[PDB]
Amino acid sequence: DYRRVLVCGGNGGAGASCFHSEPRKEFGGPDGGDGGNGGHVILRVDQQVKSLSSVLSRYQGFSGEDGGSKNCFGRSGAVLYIRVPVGTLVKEGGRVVADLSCVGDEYIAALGGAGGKGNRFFLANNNRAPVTCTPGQPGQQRVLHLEL
């Protein structure tokens, strides 16, 4: 009938900033792996679902793992799906941000923050030893109201 839901998209992992060193190559270069993206929160329409009792009032999109050493990347946050009845108006502040009437329809409520880059990403001929590691972008956190 009507449910106030707090969807919080995942947070991208912060890239690492390390450097390689191996027996016969001491200055082996950057190993900062990039962080995984945050898992988006997507309201997928469900025909079986007929009321908004199922949907919770607090959804936290999974956050991506931080980048590791050895150029290891971070597992991106998995997509969180909110099954909703067919014909569900989604409104932020009386905005009707979505209608979600058709079967198979889906609206991305809170996009998971993108993952942060590692130093090896900035590695280049000009930059032979980057120290930068962009922090993982924060995930969206908004309050969406669902009306049948």
Partner RNA sequence: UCCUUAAAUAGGGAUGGCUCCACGAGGGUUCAGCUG
Partner RNA sequence: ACCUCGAUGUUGGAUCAGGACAUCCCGAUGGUGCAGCCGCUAUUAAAGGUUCGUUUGUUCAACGAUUAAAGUCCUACGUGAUCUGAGUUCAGACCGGAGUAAUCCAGGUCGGUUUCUAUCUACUUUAAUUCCUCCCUGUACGAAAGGACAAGAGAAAUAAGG
Chain residues in the site for RNA (CB under 7 A): 19-25, 27-30, 33, 36, 47-48, 50-51, 53-54, 56-57, 64-65, 68, 70-76, 123-125, 128-129
Q: How far is the CB of 63 from RNA (least distance, A)?
A: 12
Q: How far is the CB of 100 from RNA (least distance, A)?
A: 17
Given the complex with RNA, which of 95 and 147 has the nearer CB atom?
147
Helix (H, G, I), strand (E, B) or coil at 5: strand
Q: How far is the CB of 88 from RNA (least distance, A)?
A: 14
What gap in Å lies between CA 39 and CA 101, rounded to an integer?
Answer: 24
Torsion angle of alpha carbons 45, 47, 53, 55, nearest 10°? Answer: -30
Q: How far is the CB of 91 from RNA (least distance, A)?
A: 21
Given the complex with RNA, which of 97 and 123 has the nearer CB atom?
123
Given the complex with RNA, which of 67 and 107 has the nearer CB atom?
67
Q: Determine the Cα angle at 77 with ends 75 and 79, to 5°.
A: 135
Structure tokens at 22: 């191996």
What gap in Å lies between CA 133 and CA 139, rounded to an integer?
Answer: 18
Given the complex with RNA, which of 97 and 148 has the nearer CB atom?
148
What gap in Å lies between CA 91 and CA 100, rounded to an integer?
Answer: 11
